[PDB]
Design a protein around this nucleic acid. Structure first.
Ligand SMILES: [Mg+2]
Ligand SMILES: [Mg+2]
Ligand SMILES: [Mg+2]
Ligand SMILES: [Mg+2]
Ligand SMILES: [Mg+2]
Ligand SMILES: [Mg+2]
Ligand SMILES: [Mg+2]
Ligand SMILES: [Mg+2]
Ligand SMILES: [Mg+2]
Ligand SMILES: [Mg+2]
Ligand SMILES: [Mg+2]
Ligand SMILES: [Mg+2]
Ligand SMILES: [Mg+2]
Ligand SMILES: [Mg+2]
Ligand SMILES: [Mg+2]
Ligand SMILES: [Mg+2]
Ligand SMILES: [Mg+2]
Ligand SMILES: [Mg+2]
Ligand SMILES: [Mg+2]
Ligand SMILES: [Mg+2]
Ligand SMILES: [Mg+2]
Ligand SMILES: [Mg+2]
Ligand SMILES: [Mg+2]
Ligand SMILES: [Mg+2]
Ligand SMILES: [Mg+2]
Ligand SMILES: [Mg+2]
Ligand SMILES: [Mg+2]
Ligand SMILES: [Mg+2]
Ligand SMILES: [Mg+2]
Ligand SMILES: [Mg+2]
Ligand SMILES: [Mg+2]
Ligand SMILES: [Mg+2]
Ligand SMILES: [Mg+2]
Ligand SMILES: [Mg+2]
Ligand SMILES: [Mg+2]
Ligand SMILES: [Mg+2]
Lengths: 200, 98, 203, 52, 148, 53
RNA sequence: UGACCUCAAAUCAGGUAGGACUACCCGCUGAACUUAAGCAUAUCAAUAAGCGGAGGAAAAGAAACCAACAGGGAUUGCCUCAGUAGCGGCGAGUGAAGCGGCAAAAGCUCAAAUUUGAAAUCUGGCGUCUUUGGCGUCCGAGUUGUAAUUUGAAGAAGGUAUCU
RNA sequence: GUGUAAAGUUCCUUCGACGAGUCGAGUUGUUUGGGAAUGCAGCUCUAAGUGGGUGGUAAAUUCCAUCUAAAGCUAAAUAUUG
């Protein structure tokens, strides 16, 4: 059962696995039908775009801080800054997210600029609008017309300025301060109460 | 700004320009209102005290703060809730001394 | 109004007044049939909270359900297996007594849709529940824009499928890490995690 | 069983390699003749015709 | 292809290459990793030492995103400079104007100090650096700027 | 109420606000929520409570 | 002489449920063969058999969520995370989730509020009409609360510049 | 079209009701990757109002973060030996 110099394997096939085998023979068929559904959805509402305008948000965690991606909807504050009510915004191709907020100014400003760019290209028809004007428009792809763009990494030339303390020493001191903050604060509190209680 | 600007230590992280956030109304959930304060005071008059709450009051009157807390934790379940219940039963006693 | 007072007073279940009322009503409910029709909610505020309206087509049943665990119904306690499966006593039903109440009431009034239910009273042998049901064939329900939804056939015997509040509670249908196994259905999640997905161009 | 392997992956660059090799081989008269095409009366390969 | 397998060559020979004495059987020795401490000890001890037992402390709910910190050495640091402008930078770099290398924006958490740098000032932006990596960067007249 | 509404509909034909033609009603208040709210706002002068609720 | 409450009867007026099918779906109940080279925890497997309930999909679903970031943002599925953290006579075995890329995207409704200068609400009978219904009228339901108004993202009550 | 109606938009003030034998706790059984206890269920106890839940090592003290349960509806992407 165990023989030779081989890696030890974990092949989880001790249940009735063959009753739950999903083979994707329909990958191409689903691709084609998905494309047809997409054409039907587009042709139903043309020239109104099929995609709602989405915000741009930083990805969470220390691993994806650097990246920025499309969010779910614009915050109520962001829509407030451009003078659009969320109920109204949902009817002109703008997505709303009541859950997200803006702790910082950078994402808020990016999304306000994005909303103002979309708002400048918007043309809202009405009863007085005739089919000649409506036919003068093409159904654009909002996901491509207002793409999510990564901020460029800093590159190019800058003056070299060397601090006296090295970066490695700074990191070590930060680690040490964090590691001993609690015990140092407890020690200082005890010292202060001792030398200001008996010094009463 | 608000973060240290470096990846280690106390208050680590990237500095950003802070923007003041309008508080959500859902965060007001624990707040009390005039309506609920009023209704709860009358219901206390109509309903009265529970059997374990009368037992708690006797222990507090007999100077058993340590005894009352052990009972209140045994009844309510957690130490945090027992502390609030004993404080509430002392205020009931404090309102019966006039 | 008075519903706030009713709400605050039912939370004082160990007060003298509420204890007296519970004694009297427990005796009276025990003196009736196991399942009987209630002419009105005994807790109008609690019924309101759970979607009941004083309209034609809203019905209340009171039901009495035996307390305790689920004894294994094997003859003479012999399980015929491995010692890990030899338990007969101290075994528990996976549904609540509230769900059993709802299902028996829905079985009795098979022409109605079980809207919801609530606890009313208790003794050592029984728990007592009141079940709010809705008549889907009554025009006061069919023309009600807030209650048309339960006329659609996907809500047939929703209490038998665990779609009431008690049923969704017993199914583990909640958000978060504490409900990883049962968030979207336990058996669906298990089937998804035990399926061998093979593509045309194998990776 | 249906979960037998049916489709086979080929590296994209190698597939392009082979496509280029086949296009190049289409201009070799000996290869086109061994391939079985009745091309003996075509004066030169590649055979390029006008856009009409 | 089945036509290339030795099953096609064993046709006509009684035992199909399994032996007349051994007699290919269902599961002699057990299934899987059975008997790893009893009759397959000689195999696991020889080829997989350390297999049995516990070492170290558990970590309930380990999120690997916390430990994301890809390394880049110093001999690979100038590959992050734009290829079309590397040669100009290698010539005209000075203390007054040196290329900035944003290592985090390229997907790296720590700068390590293997290899040799061009004797050319650079500004390296990193989350973490090693002691020797920063000593080598400063020696060519550069600097390490901590970011987060 | 039907007769009062008929009179008010006659009055709105004349161009009046229909509030001048009908006097301010002085009646008995009922309804448990309504009466509880009236008591809480110090508006009830007298409350009669049934003994067999 | 009449209300009310509770409880009955009628071949009362009008309705509704049951049963079938099995591939998928929502639950309950529930093994053992088998693997561990024996075997009892474990494994098979939260599977088979058994029971209840649906639909064209079902279920889930607009956070009492994930996170610990410079923060994401209903649900579902795929790829990945990952045969990983972990669980395990720590043996045989087993084993998710967050992030990330994508498919598809859609949001909302009650209870808790005095209409109180007017139960403004609704089933039914009768009549009539242009009949998936409208109008008129009369009983009934309903104040132990049917409408309008609000749902936390808010919102209400006053004042408010006027605009769309 | 009965639009002196209905709805939204700016600012100020006073307020801002928000689900109980439920949450939560103990114990028992089952289950889970959930490990001083992941969910579910039985029994016993049984709340509060900036309270309550969660923050994957039990406990007390001090903070912080994040949602807002115990009521309800909802297409699509997903499944499909009928
Ligand atoms: Mg192993
Ligand atoms: Mg946040
Ligand atoms: Mg709060
Ligand atoms: Mg009791
Ligand atoms: Mg058995
Ligand atoms: Mg031979
Ligand atoms: Mg032979
Ligand atoms: Mg051989
Ligand atoms: Mg032989
Ligand atoms: Mg031999
Ligand atoms: Mg052999
Ligand atoms: Mg009849
Ligand atoms: Mg049937
Ligand atoms: Mg079983
Ligand atoms: Mg088998
Ligand atoms: Mg065996
Ligand atoms: Mg054997
Ligand atoms: Mg045996
Ligand atoms: Mg199992
Ligand atoms: Mg079965
Ligand atoms: Mg059908
Ligand atoms: Mg579909
Ligand atoms: Mg559905
Ligand atoms: Mg909400
Ligand atoms: Mg999500
Ligand atoms: Mg398992
Ligand atoms: Mg994603
Ligand atoms: Mg009528
Ligand atoms: Mg709530
Ligand atoms: Mg079981
Ligand atoms: Mg447990
Ligand atoms: Mg329990
Ligand atoms: Mg909800
Ligand atoms: Mg639903
Ligand atoms: Mg298929
Ligand atoms: Mg089919």
């Amino acid at each position: 059962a165990i023989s030779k110099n081989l890696p030890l394997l974990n092949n989880h096939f001790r249940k009735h696995w063959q009753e739950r085998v999903r083979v994707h023979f329909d990958q191409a068929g689903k691709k084609a039908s998905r494309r047809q559904s997409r054409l039907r959805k587009a042709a139903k509402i043309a020239p109104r775009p099929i995609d709602a305008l989405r915000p741009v948000v930083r990805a969470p965690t220390v691993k994806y801080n650097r990246k920025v991606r499309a969010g779910r909807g614009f915050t109520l504050a962001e829509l407030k800054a451009v003078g659009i009510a969320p109920k109204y915004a949902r009817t002109i191709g703008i997505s709303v997210d009541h859950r997200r907020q803006n702790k910082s100014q950078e994402t808020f400003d990016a999304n306000v600029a994005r909303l103002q760019e979309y708002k400048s290209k918007l043309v809202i028809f009405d009863k007085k609008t005739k089919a000649s004007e409506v036919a003068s428009f093409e159904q654009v792809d909002v996901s491509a017309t207002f793409p999510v763009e990564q901020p460029a990494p800093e590159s190019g030339l800058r003056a070299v300025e060397v601090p006296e303390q090295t970066a490695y020493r700074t990191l070590r001191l930060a680690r040490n301060e964090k590691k001993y903050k609690g015990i140092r604060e407890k020690r200082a509190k005890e010292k202060a109460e001792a030398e200001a209680e008996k010094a009463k | 700004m608000a973060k240290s600007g470096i990846a280690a230590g106390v208050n680590k992280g990237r500095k950003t320009t802070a923007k003041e956030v309008a508080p959500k109304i859902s965060y007001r959930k624990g707040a009390s209102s005039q309506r609920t304060v009023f209704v709860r005071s009358i219901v206390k008059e109509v309903a009265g005290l529970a059997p374990y709450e009368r037992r708690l009051i006797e222990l507090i009157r007999n100077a058993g703060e340590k005894r009352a807390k052990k009972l209140a934790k045994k009844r309510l379940g957690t130490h945090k809730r027992a502390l609030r219940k004993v404080e509430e039963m002392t205020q009931v006693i404090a309102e019966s001394r006039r | 109004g008075a519903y706030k007072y009713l709400e605050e007073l039912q939370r004082k279940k160990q007060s003298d007044v509420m204890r007296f009322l519970y004694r009297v009503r427990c005796w009276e409910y025990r003196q009736k049939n196991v399942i009987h029709r209630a002419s009105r909610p005994s807790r109008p505020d609690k019924a309101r909270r759970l979607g009941y309206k004083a309209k034609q087509g809203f019905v209340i049943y009171r039901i009495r359900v035996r307390r305790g665990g689920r004894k294994r119904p094997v003859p003479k306690g012999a399980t015929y297996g491995k010692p890990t499966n030899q338990g007969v006593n101290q075994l528990k039903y996976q549904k609540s007594l509230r769900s059993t109440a709802e299902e028996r009431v829905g079985r009795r009034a098979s022409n109605l849709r079980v809207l919801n239910s609530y606890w009313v009273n208790q003794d050592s042998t029984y728990k007592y529940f009141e079940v709010i049901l809705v008549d889907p064939s009554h025009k006061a329900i069919r023309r009600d824009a807030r209650y048309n939804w339960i006329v659609n056939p996907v809500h047939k015997h929703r209490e038998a499928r665990g779609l009431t509040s008690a049923g969704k509670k017993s199914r583990g249908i909640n958000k978060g890490h504490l409900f990883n196994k049962t968030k979207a259905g336990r058996r669906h999640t298990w089937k998804k995690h035990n399926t061998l997905s093979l593509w045309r161009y194998r990776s | 069983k249906t979960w037998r392997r049916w489709n086979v992956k080929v590296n994209h660059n190698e597939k392009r390699y082979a496509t280029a090799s086949a296009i190049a081989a289409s201009a070799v008269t000996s290869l086109v003749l061994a391939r079985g095409h009745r091309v003996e009366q075509v004066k030169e390969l590649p055979l390029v015709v006008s856009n009409e | 292809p089945t036509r290339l397998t030795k099953t096609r060559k064993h046709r006509g020979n009684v035992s199909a290459g399994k032996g007349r004495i051994g007699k290919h059987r269902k599961h002699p020795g057990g299934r899987g990793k059975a008997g790893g401490q009893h009759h397959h000890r000689t195999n696991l001890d020889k080829y997989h030492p350390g297999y049995f037992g516990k070492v170290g402390m558990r970590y309930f709910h380990k999120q690997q995103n916390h430990f994301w910190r890809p390394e880049i050495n110093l001999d690979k640091l100038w590959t992050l400079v734009d290829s079309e402008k590397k040669d100009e930078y290698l010539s005209k770099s000075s203390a007054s104007a040196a290329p900035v290398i944003d290592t985090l924006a390229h997907g790296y958490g720590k700068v390590l100090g293997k290899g040799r740098l061009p004797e050319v000032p650079v500004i390296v932006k990193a989350r973490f650096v090693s002691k020797l990596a920063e000593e080598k960067i400063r020696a060519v007249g550069g600097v390490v700027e901590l970011v987060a | 109420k039907k007769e009062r509404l008929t009179k008010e509909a006659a009055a709105i034909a004349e161009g009046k606000t229909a509030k001048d033609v009908s006097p301010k009603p002085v009646v008995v208040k009922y309804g448990l929520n309504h009466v509880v709210s009236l008591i809480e706002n110090k508006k009830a002068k007298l409350v009669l409570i049934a003994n067999d609720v």
